[PDB]
Design a protein around this ligand. Structure first.
Ligand SMILES: CC[C@H](C)[C@H](CCC[C@H]1CC[C@H]2C[C@@H](OC(=O)CCC(=O)O)CC[C@]2(C)C1)[C@H](C)CCCC(C)C
Ligand SMILES: CC[C@H](C)[C@H](CCC[C@H]1CC[C@H]2C[C@@H](OC(=O)CCC(=O)O)CC[C@]2(C)C1)[C@H](C)CCCC(C)C
Ligand SMILES: CC[C@H](C)[C@H](CCC[C@H]1CC[C@H]2C[C@@H](OC(=O)CCC(=O)O)CC[C@]2(C)C1)[C@H](C)CCCC(C)C
Ligand SMILES: CC[C@H](C)[C@H](CCC[C@H]1CC[C@H]2C[C@@H](OC(=O)CCC(=O)O)CC[C@]2(C)C1)[C@H](C)CCCC(C)C
Lengths: 465, 465, 465, 465
């Protein structure tokens, strides 16, 4: 009873909402008629799996059995076509009930009319055994009518695109890979049908003496050898190679060769387009860094900077972004509030634990300080703090080595200047590339204004010193 | 009388302005000479439709009648060329009056000189019956002069581009589809003319014994069979296949084969370029999400985050953007003032109606509150509100489930903390992925400052509690 | 005397600065040695023009005279090679003086060493008559040494790239067109040299009985027919066609055919890449609008908006951006101060002249008001001003039609509300798509604070009403 | 002893941190077992260099020795295969110790299981001499088993990608060039193996009378001639040319020809994709300027500006950005504090030294003024300062010429207006394109508030004047 209703999985929770959001859709399926199928249920998924396997089997086997074999009266050929057309006739009946994702679940007002207006005629032609009707009522004209079963490609293309739009939502998949697999699966099928058609056309003309089958003397070999030579001819026309020694003499050979060349040329052009779209999406973060550095060196060339400054800015961007493009401010802006706190507790927590003033504080005070740190990268030779300055910023050390006028990683300098609000006494020069965390004086005074209990403690520090 | 003036349709209102803006253009057409055509009128549209149908008919039929048939004295061939060249001679006369969109409507100062300086000579050559003049004054040399009618391609290319620049403004069309249809329509016509030229060249030489027509023994067949073999040869040269058993022996066969190969190669290269430009524009919102997540995981790799935090940020972006790239702030910034209010009345109106304090308010007060809500997404396990905090924000619940230390969809929590301005007492943990609407305390105090009548009501609440 | 110094043209003013900036470079050329050429002067331009014409002539004519003709002792062939190698030997001497744009003008320290370290050996080999030396000292081995003159392609590629980097600065040119013309000019030259090589290889072997020349029986025809057949063979190998009836039998035919196929395949791949890069840059402003609307409809699909709101936002973006992407704020930010004032005096000046209060003002007061107008687009059905509101904004009408609860273009409404600072009395509904200019109350109060003389005038208005 | 530990070079400092960060990794290698190799050490680099040279040698030589020579019992062929398979067996043993960069250094828990689960079976098959075992236990069936040595391509692809991900971090390399060199190196190897396979297949069938070897009569020639003809056949199938006079008759010739055509077609499509991705990254800063100017002229076309204003804005953008796209504000934002000061000391220091008031100041005062200058570009004809204005900004002159109502480069005007805070007396018109540095009055008053010692000096100026 509940197999026709949408179950609660990851896809239904992502496409509807909570569990209560899925219960409303289940009640909506209940508010429809007697037995109405929902297109996200498990019954429709199992049925579409069975039908997709049958469509692949029929669209591979049916041209080969028609074109390369003797008669349509052999006993495995009749049982295979009658039992398959029964299942494709049940797929016509069950499409009156499923409803169309635009969802539509009301019956029979919108489903039946929206199905009759769009896809009923093609499914009706590809469902019924048309050739057996003309055979019972009334021989080589029935082999043309048996190719109406190849209109089951239209409901194959519909049923593949219904699953992929689901499975882009359930999983994380690249769209280029899915689309190029769809293109490869179409190209193989068109080459197979063209290989069957190359031998189908001279067979209806009782093998004229100018066709390739009578020239190469392969009228009475096995069907495998005939299929191999016909597929070689169709693939050499498809990939635009050049076949044979003489130009085609008969009139249906010329036009069908030209049709094969046009279809192969446009399929190969679409394959090149998909391969280019796949290759351009591989190295995006490497490419955007290159474009950004092109703009940087263009800014250098506009103001006519010297060569040493150009080299120095290049070394700075190499040690800053590392050939890798990102923008930390927008990434920290997009995240939520518990996710920003978790990243800072990995990077900035351990350096503040070295400082004796912040170690004894409450954790409600420390986390407000940790959000206002800023990441800075320096060079060997750069003077970090200069003498005679106001000293507004306090620095923590993550990596690198620097000297006061040696301080290794995990240290700190300029701490007492933010408390005394006076002139800096010493000067600091970086010995190598340093990674620092900076705290300004106003960003600390705001947090002192947020907590008056910690404000009393730093007043007792200032009275002692 | 008013057929020469621009009528008032969607295109004229979009390209000029209001109805009064179109009346000024109609008065400008009236201020011109005796009978002056405006290029956006209905007369020019109907005339260009008739002329485009004639150009397609002549550029298809005229090479086939010249190259594959016997004489130019048959009675349907004379009537078809005299009645068509009369219409192409009227198109030369009416171009003195229409005026050129750069508009120009003044006559005959700018129109006549700007037409004589650009396109008069080509239209004059492609208009007049040049071969009949040389035939009356004075035979196989007239078949070369009859191909001057193929310069009607130049005014075909002009008349197609005049409609498409209109119909990009009237309707919403993709530019890649229009441009690739123009390329396909050009490629078919060049292949048709090359198919006629392959048989035209040996005919003027009275079929030498080394040409392909005398080798394949098809001098005296029908014109359909000759056209099919000539088009097969031209298409195999065009798609770069390889033709025949021997290399071409005669000198006009070699150079014209080389010209066909060069023209086909450059047309196929432009087709691959257009197919790539069409494929790259299909999945843009899917691709920009992938580039953004490449930058996100690069930001992860720079600071060397642990694996569980990487997985958690990935799950957050999956449940936030859903594989789909957009930026809500700029989209809400671009819209107008009545359009922003209509979107909020669909999403944020129903949740505020649950709250008993905002239900009895005036609608002028509620809509100022509704603009300042912010959309937030949380995770299972994240603590939404923590104990011991100031509690500046009030939260409404759209989806998801959470627990106080169960609250389903449509609920709210933290409401009394914004009124009391005190410390939060309880803690809230989200059981699953929640979608919340947040209102800060300052964004509500601004709206309380906007309306002093509602400020009195919340004072009566604070005195009772 | 002044022909060796850089003259004052548009390029020199763009690459140096003012006239005084060019005088310093002229004095720098004067501070060099006795006769030193500057690479931006007129002498170097005229000399490079003469040399580029000679290089095109020699690189076209020299393979054909060697491979297809009888002897190198004919009197026009000796005079043409002696007088040309004199000019290519003067180009070796004058490269010791010109100096290299990295500029370098100091002689002979940097110029001579930087020339000897890079390009002296190739120019020395391509300059001197090597084969005549071996002919005087000591026959078919001299035809191989005469192809050392084809190393003049290396200084051709240098002299073309020196002009294009100049002429991208003098004029505005698309880079894709220049680069694809360079590629086409290289491809034609490689096909020409391969056409000469196809006949050069069997000639040194005294025409073996297995080569294509002895099979097709063309040993004793004219040089034009031999060149046409050899170029057809090289082009069919170049465009990957397929030649002849039998596979090549001799060993130098196989490897040189394979070299031709590899060179043609990589040149055709680079041509497809350049054609794609050219096609992608044609419709950029059309494509960015499509990407922006993809993000808009994705924002619609995320919050699950109804269909009528989707249609309404689509109509708004059609009447706002018109299928055309731009961002007015950044464009107005990039411009200078006199350019922003000129655009506003075209668009916003005529509407403010209708208002009687702003007509009698000083022009210093009006232009400060005109910078703070904002462009707004409304829809039919939207209520512009509602009753019971504060009325902070005053609106001017450019296009469209609206009704008070009819006001055509050029009108205004809501003017008295900004002066009285009271509640709006009437309501305005737009009948069609309107284009309005908005002025807020604070943006007008700032300009009233800027000018106290106009502040007295609006006080006399408020006392009368 | 220290050869197995990661040394301190530029790559290790970039991938770990400081010297103390590398010492922790060396202690981590010490904390592992008896002899454990670190994958960034020098031993693994030298070993991978030796193994990559051996893999290139074996994958080139091994098909040619099997397919084109007589027997596998010749004495150089046995010594070359036994001594090479010893080295490929040592590479199997040393992969139990190196540890996998995901790093992993713990043994044998994670290394051995993570190696057995992924790549042990392929390396085991490609390591051992399988054919000699079947030869000792028990002839043409051993030539098929000897091609198991061609599974050494799998550890070649692994060892190339391990170096390139290192050498993208050590040096600055474009990713497109590296990836297209990998593709070319793969394509040459596949064409070589296909050339060996074309002759391998008829040899196992004892040269049937229908194969190409017996048709072209080359059974008993040398191995070089057979290799040249086989490679020509495989390359003509690979580049999709068309081979021979007749279609292939035998069944293994048809299917292997079809496999060659499919492999060549997909490799050529990937080559076109890589060439397009390489060409699109050459002219990025030229292309972004073109896209920006497309948006500019679209903003012009939306508001229907006159032609002279369009020309004037075009001339402004030509003299502003010079066909070259950059954004100075974000570039100055990304840099550090000592790098911003170094650029200003090149450009803005020399112009301020002309002014007599700023020459006698302290250098701590001047550098705070220099950060607040703004770069401006004017046109000929634009009025820079107008009479009757407040005069908030002071201007310095870098280039260009202008007149007061002549001032060359290096001058200044409007200096006294910022000190007097009064109305400007004169008007300035630019004679040509000027480049100016602007200082506002509030940006100077902030620096006067920063330094009270300089504030006393400008008070003594104001009392004298
Ligand atoms: C991957 C392509 C999927 C093939 C689609 C169907 C199953 C998809 C899945 C099947 C297995 C999955 C395993 C998944 O790994 C996880 O599930 C995460 C970790 C975990 O929870 O175990 C990653 C990709 C996924 C490969 C993709 C495919 C686009 C549809 C083709 C089916 C039909 C239309 C011919
Ligand atoms: C679509 C391409 C249009 C073909 C152009 C001419 C009619 C255009 C129209 C004709 C029918 C339209 C129906 C339209 O649908 C609506 O009109 C919106 C709903 C409604 O109001 O009904 C969408 C696309 C439109 C397909 C496009 C085309 C670019 C020009 C080619 C004509 C000539 C140069 C050979
Ligand atoms: C256009 C390509 C130019 C061909 C280059 C040399 C002259 C350039 C000029 C020659 C004529 C120009 C006319 C110019 O129009 C104007 O000058 C603006 C209006 C005016 O002032 O008249 C636009 C493009 C310009 C076409 C381009 C080209 C890139 C270099 C090739 C020369 C050599 C390396 C083979
Ligand atoms: C360049 C490609 C490098 C070839 C890689 C290996 C050495 C790399 C180096 C070797 C020489 C370098 C010289 C370097 O120039 C400098 O070192 C800066 C100035 C200086 O310090 O001297 C620029 C590029 C570098 C060319 C690149 C390449 C991607 C790996 C291929 C090796 C193996 C996988 C087949």
């Amino acid at each position: 009873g509940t197999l026709l209703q949408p179950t609660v999985n990851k896809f239904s929770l992502r496409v509807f909402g909570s569990h209560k959001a899925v219960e409303i859709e289940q009640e909506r399926v209940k508010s429809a008629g007697a037995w109405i199928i929902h297109p996200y249920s498990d019954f429709r998924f199992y049925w579409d799996l069975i039908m997709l396997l049958l469509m692949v089997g029929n669209l591979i086997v049916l041209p080969v059995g028609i074109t390369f074999f003797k008669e349509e009266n052999s006993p495995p050929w009749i049982v295979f076509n009658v039992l398959s057309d029964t299942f494709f006739l049940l797929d016509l009946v069950l499409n009156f009930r499923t409803g169309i994702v635009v969802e539509i679940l009301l019956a029979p007002r919108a489903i039946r009319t929206r199905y009759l207006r769009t896809w009923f005629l093609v499914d009706l032609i590809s469902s019924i055994p048309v050739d057996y009707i003309f055979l019972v009522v009334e021989v080589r004209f029935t082999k043309i009518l048996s190719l109406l079963r190849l209109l089951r490609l239209s409901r194959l293309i519909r049923y593949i695109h219904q699953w992929e739009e689901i499975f882009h939502m359930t999983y994380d998949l690249a769209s280029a890979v899915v689309r190029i697999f769809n293109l490869i699966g179409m190209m193989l099928l068109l080459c197979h049908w063209d290989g069957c058609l190359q031998f189908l056309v001279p067979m209806l003309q009782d093998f004229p003496p100018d066709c390739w089958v009578s020239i190469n003397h392969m009228v009475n070999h096995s069907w495998g050898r005939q299929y191999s030579h016909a597929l070689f001819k169709a693939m050499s026309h498809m990939l635009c190679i050049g076949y044979g020694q003489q130009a085609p003499v008969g009139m249906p050979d010329v036009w069908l060769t030209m049709l094969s060349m046009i279809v192969g040329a446009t399929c190969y052009a679409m394959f090149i387009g998909h391969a280019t779209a796949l290759i351009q999406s591989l190295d995006s973060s490497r490419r955007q860094y290159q474009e950004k550095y092109k703009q940087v060196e263009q800014y250098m060339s506009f103001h006519k900077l010297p060569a040493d400054t150009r080299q120095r800015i290049h070394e700075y961007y190499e040690h800053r972004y590392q050939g890798k493009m990102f923008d930390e401010e927008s990434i920290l802006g997009e995240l939520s509030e518990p996710l920003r706190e978790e990243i800072i507790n990995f990077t900035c927590r351990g350096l503040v634990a070295h400082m004796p003033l912040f170690a004894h504080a409450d954790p409600s005070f420390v986390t407000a300080v940790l959000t206002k740190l800023r990441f800075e990268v320096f060079q060997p030779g750069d003077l970090v703090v200069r003498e005679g300055s106001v000293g507004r910023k306090m620095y923590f050390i993550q990596h690198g080595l620097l000297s006061v006028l040696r301080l290794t990683d995990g240290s700190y300098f300029g701490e007492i200047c933010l408390l005394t609000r006076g002139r800096r006494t010493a000067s600091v020069r970086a010995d190598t590339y340093c990674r620092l965390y900076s705290l300004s004086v106003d960003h600390f005074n705001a947090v002192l204004e947020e907590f008056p209990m910690m404000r009393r403690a730093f007043e007792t520090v200032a009275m002692d010193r």
